[PDB]
């Protein structure tokens, strides 16, 4: 069973994705954060993995100005489910969107 989504809107917070992959015992969204809802800005040791795929990186790139989302699961990444859903809206949005899982799916729905 290997599923791995992540969704970011306009770099929204509200996992434990703050403090770090392993725990979270620490907060901050001042840093950024990969598809593995985790920050390297507080031990960036134990945290940070790379079992993830090298996208993980670009994601922080992507979310950095723009916004993409992409969604990709194999039985041979390593076994890791990570469900994060993050929802966002402002004035400035005009699609309103609830901002959940479905939205993921959006990569191709």
């Excluded at 039985?75 to 809206?89: C, M, P, S």
Aim: hydrophobic content about 40%; overall charge negative.
């Amino acid at each position: 069973m290997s599923e791995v989504n992540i969704v970011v809107n306009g770099r929204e917070a509200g996992s434990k994705s703050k403090g770090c992959a392993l725990c979270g015992a620490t907060w901050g969204d001042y840093h950024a954060d990969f598809l593995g809802e985790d920050l390297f800005f507080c031990c960036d040791i134990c945290a940070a993995e790379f079992m993830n795929m090298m996208d993980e990186a670009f994601k922080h790139t992507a979310r950095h100005n723009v916004d993409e989302l992409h969604i990709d699961g194999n039985y041979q990444l390593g076994r890791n489910v990570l469900l994060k859903n993050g929802e966002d809206r402002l004035r400035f949005y005009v699609k309103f969107g609830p901002g959940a899982v479905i939205k993921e799916f959006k990569i191709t729905d």
